[PDB]
Write a protein that binds this ligand. Structure first.
Ligand SMILES: [Zn+2]
Ligand SMILES: [Zn+2]
Ligand SMILES: [Zn+2]
Length: 230
């Protein structure tokens, strides 16, 4: 039932309802040779919507907004990028031009600027130390520590028990480390354990790329990270 690359033409976006008032958005992008999918999240926020992460690029993200407008028909008022890479902030300029308030931690904004990437406008305070959590409307934002990147955030929807791990969490089908150029391999397992300890009640876990699962995706990711380390 969950959308794969097979069902998503390049430049198109699919939505998938995870639970009441929670959706994931799925887009595709061509890396050198292969095509990769990418997940973000949509969370109902009263009569508005909170967006988690772009659809990886300007065209994809405009397609994302059109697909939201068509299927849910509620306005996207805020967006949060969960780290500084292009599959998370690429398309921020498109969101901004459409009247969406874009948000990221100062850590993420700093690293985006150094990378020459798009920079979310607003800053999320209170997330600078590992284990920090802040409320953002219908979600909790959590900084577990450095993992896939030094700034990576995860997002929990308490009304639906949905944990969005972004790129700090691997899908089960991924049995080898991905792009770890900006990762902290030494801290990644410790950061995953912080997620485990903070959200032991999570029922759905969404990786940055690929199929949703349960909390076993956390142990999976630790397994793969330790194998890469060694
Ligand atoms: Zn990344
Ligand atoms: Zn603003
Ligand atoms: Zn990623």
């Amino acid at each position: 039932e969950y959308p794969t690359v097979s069902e998503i033409p390049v430049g198109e976006v699919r939505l998938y309802q995870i639970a009441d008032g929670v959706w994931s958005h799925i887009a595709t992008q061509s890396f050198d040779g292969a095509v990769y999918p990418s997940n973000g999240l949509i969370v109902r926020d009263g009569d508005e919507l909170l967006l988690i992460d772009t659809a990886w690029g300007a065209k994809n993200t405009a397609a994302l907004l059109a697909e939201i407008e068509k299927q849910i028909g509620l306005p996207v008022t805020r967006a949060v990028s969960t780290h500084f890479h292009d599959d998370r902030v690429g398309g921020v300029d498109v969101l901004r031009a459409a009247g969406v308030a874009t948000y990221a931690s100062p850590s993420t904004r700093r690293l985006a600027e150094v990378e020459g990437n798009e920079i979310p406008t607003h800053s999320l305070e209170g997330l600078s130390s590992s284990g920090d959590a802040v409320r953002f409307g219908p979600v909790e934002l959590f900084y577990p520590g450095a993992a896939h990147s030094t700034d990576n955030l995860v997002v929990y929807v308490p009304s639906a028990s949905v944990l969005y791990g972004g790129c700090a969490i691997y899908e089960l089908s991924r049995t080898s480390a991905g792009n770890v150029a900006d990762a902290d391999l030494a801290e990644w397992p410790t950061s995953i354990e912080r997620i485990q300890q903070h959200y032991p009640e999570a029922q759905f876990v969404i990786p940055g790329h690929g199929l949703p699962g349960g909390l076993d995706l956390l142990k999976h990711t630790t397994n793969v990270v330790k194998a890469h380390t060694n």
